[PDB]
Amino acid sequence: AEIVLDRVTKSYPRAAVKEFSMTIADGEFIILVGPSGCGKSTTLNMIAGLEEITSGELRIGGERVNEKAPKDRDIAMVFQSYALYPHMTVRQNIAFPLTLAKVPKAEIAAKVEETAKILDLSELLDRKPGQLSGGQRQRVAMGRAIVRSPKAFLMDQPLSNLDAKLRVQMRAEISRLQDRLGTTTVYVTHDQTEAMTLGDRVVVMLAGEVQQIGTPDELYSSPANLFVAGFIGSPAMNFFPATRTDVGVRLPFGEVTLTPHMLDLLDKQARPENIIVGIRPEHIEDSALLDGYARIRALTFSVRADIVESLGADKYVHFTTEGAGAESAQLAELAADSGAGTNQFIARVSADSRVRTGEQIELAIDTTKLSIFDAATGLNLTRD
């Protein structure tokens, strides 16, 4: 049911889950997402019981439960390495929680057949987990976690050992199966695709402090940091240095004039000196198919196209613009995960665009869907 946990903290003898506080309501499909090495998984371990908590509650329902070991919580946790016993058979594996719960064997066989019907394990119930591939062993693990009908369903990065062609079908399967069962869930992940497709309220986590909590589309539109901004989205948002000219800003290319409302919202706090701007790769079109009123705010003069990935419904043009000022701590720890080089910028333009590799193309930003950030305190200024 409802898992409300407040002020939860960990202290490694160092501060990995500092001040975690919210309520995972009943029915949600929460998602803990963050770079590998943050408090995204220790939080799940502490919600399960495999580690000791320091402070705060974990009251699943109406009972403070941070003082127990898990046999009295009824929370199934499917592991990553598919921790399933290699000497029992698939039927015994899927049945083990029941046979420990002291239920007569007739209902055991009935429920096990029911679950193996929910999945595609119709015939495999007579083979050890040794003669099983990745996908079917993963499904055996998930079935073992389904049967008990617990309060929470604490998934732990289960889809990490599967081929890229199978992971998408598995994500659809997991989302539909959870929407069918409906019990509370959490899910520690690693990428933004898993976190934005199967998700009801994402939770970003950097070094322990929750960066932002909201519906995935609300993390997309109005990110309230630089990490939650340049983290989600496969073509990560482009970060351009910028210096407010007190009437506008002279971005590395163009003369964007900061339409009045955002200009005054920015002038509310003229504290920093290197307030950077983020132009999402979707919001960069070309001068070819831009006919209409949108030409006046195009800011297009020309840029070279280093690499043009023509992978179908969108041409990813890479390029570079010299300068300096994309220097912070948030951006640094966001680009330590993956390489942002120095000034490599990408932009996805339409498919009808006829562009070769290594030529001069006219890219155009639209100055109505850009976000301005602060390069010292790491916090969006447009919206939050």
Partner: protein, 270 residues
């Protein structure tokens, strides 16, 4: 093409190389008082009376019961007291865990005659000479290195994540050791209680020195002693029959546990 023809004669040479010195004593323990070299194969007139000759009078019978008893009582205790010391691969200790696996394995290469002089002079007169309780202490001490080196190599291969998983089920910290954890280590203990037995079942110079009387005398000693007077002044058939009765159990044990034995001796090369 011809690779199979050239790589199938090696697979026959390496087997004939390892079966001829056994199919020699097997053909020698069947020639009745006509040991005339007649061959590694085709010994004509294979009428075995040697087998029912050496099994009359408690010269070899009791000297076989003694070896079986000592083997069992020194493999049970060796496994019990080596498993709990190989479980120190799951745990971790600062004051010398890296040197335990060095010392308790380097004492396996220890000249028996270097510690049979003081051990013999110590068992003498201190009520420990020709008797098992005098032969099971050195056997256990010399079998501990094997039972450690083949058990701490299987207590790594089993995943202890399964206990962490079973905990998240209704399993107590006690039911986990009866169900998930117990039957995983069983095929790894039955493979150490065979290596320890096979070792402690062929030891000369320890049952030849600490053993005089009828009791506490083993099978290898009583085979080396078939040049007395019982065998009718030609102890070839009798010695070969003793050797064959002794090398039957090793063959039966290797025909069945080849895979586990190799995986244990190599420690991860199955």
């Amino acid at each position: 093409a011809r690779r199979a023809t050239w790589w199938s004669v090696v697979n026959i040479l390496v087997i004939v190389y390892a079966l001829i010195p056994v199919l020699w004593i097997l053909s020698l323990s069947l020639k009745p008082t006509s040991s005339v070299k007649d061959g590694k194969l085709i010994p004509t007139e294979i009428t075995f009376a040697n087998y029912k000759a050496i099994f009359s009078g408690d010269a070899f019978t009791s000297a076989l019961f003694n070896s079986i008893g000592i083997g069992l009582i020194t493999t049970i205790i060796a496994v019990v007291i080596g498993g709990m010391a190989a479980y120190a691969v799951a745990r971790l200790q600062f004051p010398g865990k890296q040197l335990l696996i060095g010392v308790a394995l380097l004492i396996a290469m220890f000249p028996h005659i270097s510690l049979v002089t003081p051990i013999f002079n110590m068992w003498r007169g201190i009520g420990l000479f020709d008797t098992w309780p005098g032969l099971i202490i050195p056997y256990i001490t010399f079998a501990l290195p094997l039972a450690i080196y083949t058990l701490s190599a299987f207590f790594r291969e089993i995943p202890w994540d399964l206990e962490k998983a079973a905990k998240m089920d209704g399993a107590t910290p006690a039911q986990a050791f009866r169900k998930v954890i117990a039957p995983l280590a069983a095929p790894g203990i039955v493979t150490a209680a065979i290596l320890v037995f096979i070792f402690a079942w062929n030891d000369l110079l320890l049952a030849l020195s600490l053993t005089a009387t009828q009791r506490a005398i083993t099978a290898p000693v009583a085979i080396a002693n078939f040049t007395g007077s019982s065998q009718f002044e030609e102890p070839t058939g009798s010695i070969a029959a003793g050797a064959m009765v002794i090398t039957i159990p090793i063959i039966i044990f290797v025909l069945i546990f080849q895979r586990r034995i190799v995986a244990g001796l190599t420690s991860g090369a199955v």
